[model samples]
Target: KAAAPACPRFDDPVHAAADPRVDVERITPDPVWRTTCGTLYRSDSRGPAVVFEQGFLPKDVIDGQYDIESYVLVNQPSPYVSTTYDHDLYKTWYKSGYNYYIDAPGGVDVNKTIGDRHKWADQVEVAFPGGIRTEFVIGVCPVDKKTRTEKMSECVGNPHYEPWH
Candidate 1:
């Protein structure tokens, strides 16, 4: 039988802090009275990929003392590329009992610039109460077809690796 058809591959470049492709620009800072609510611009060499906010909810929500329901609004890409959760990777973080979310453009079209117009949102209504420090981690993964499967495997292996992993 012929070898299995090549799996569809996605190229996600993993950028380091020094990498020019990874640009983390702060859009807004937390209000003076409360140490919450800030905005950021996340981009790669291509251009702005996402806009994120932290501590947008009321003090009780920021404190993690109460669950607040909120929605995130993300602009749509000029051309539109399909974007979906790296669900496996995300779940691990979730299991750790952290508060966060990742919302990418519904459909990210590779041919297009993945331009500025795209918008997506991750709704966060804190499920627990009491303040919990929030941090935003954004990075890219330079993945080829073969590596896609392996990359996922590595993420799944994180638990086994524990602190070392």
Candidate 2:
């Protein structure tokens, strides 16, 4: 079978890229979660929440500068797991899925380029049967232009650490 398309990319050039500490309230009122390579946390007035090992992206590919195609949110009975894992315990946990893609410059196809960099993020608002409602924002960014090809550099600290994890 053919390989599946990568997840859609979410570009937050304005807020996510500009500042290290993103204000969750300014973007939306509902609950939000932010994940960078090794950490996952919920942004709320009470405190930020953290989800352990939400996902992972390899260091080698990132060091080579890969372009992100899109951001995908799938709402299946549970979260999907990538091939990097040996056990199924760490698979993604979600019932439904949603996807959002960044528009390429001049509406060009994004898949044709090699070593291109793209930035993106995502948010989900869920309302249950009762009055329970929650929202989350997952932010992913490309390494800064200056450190795109360097290993173990500061740029490797892009907010969305585990894009494929």
Question: TM-score for each prediction?
Answer: 0.17, 0.15
The candidate scoring highest on TM-score is: 1
TM-score of model 2 vs. true structure: 0.15
- Which runs of model 2 end up more than 4 angstroms from their true locations? 1-14, 18-48, 51-65, 70-165
How displaced is residue 158 in candidate 2, in Å? 21
- For residue 45, give model 2's deviation from the true position in Å: 22
User: Which tens-of-lDDT digit does each residue in 1-165 have in candidate 2?
Assistant: 895544333453212221123222232122222212222221221111221122221222212222122111232221111111111111222321111111110111122221124331222221110110111223222222233221223212223332332
Q: How high is the lDDT of residue 59 in model 1?
A: 27
* Deviation (Å) of 126 in candidate 2: 17
Q: All models: lDDT?
A: 0.21, 0.21
Error of 1 at 72 (Å): 21
1-165 per-residue lDDT for model 1 (tens digits): 684342222232211111122211210111111112222112111211221222111122222211011112333211111122333232322222221232211112121322223342232111111111122223222222332222322221111111100
Q: 72 in model 2: Cα distance from truth in Å?
A: 8.3
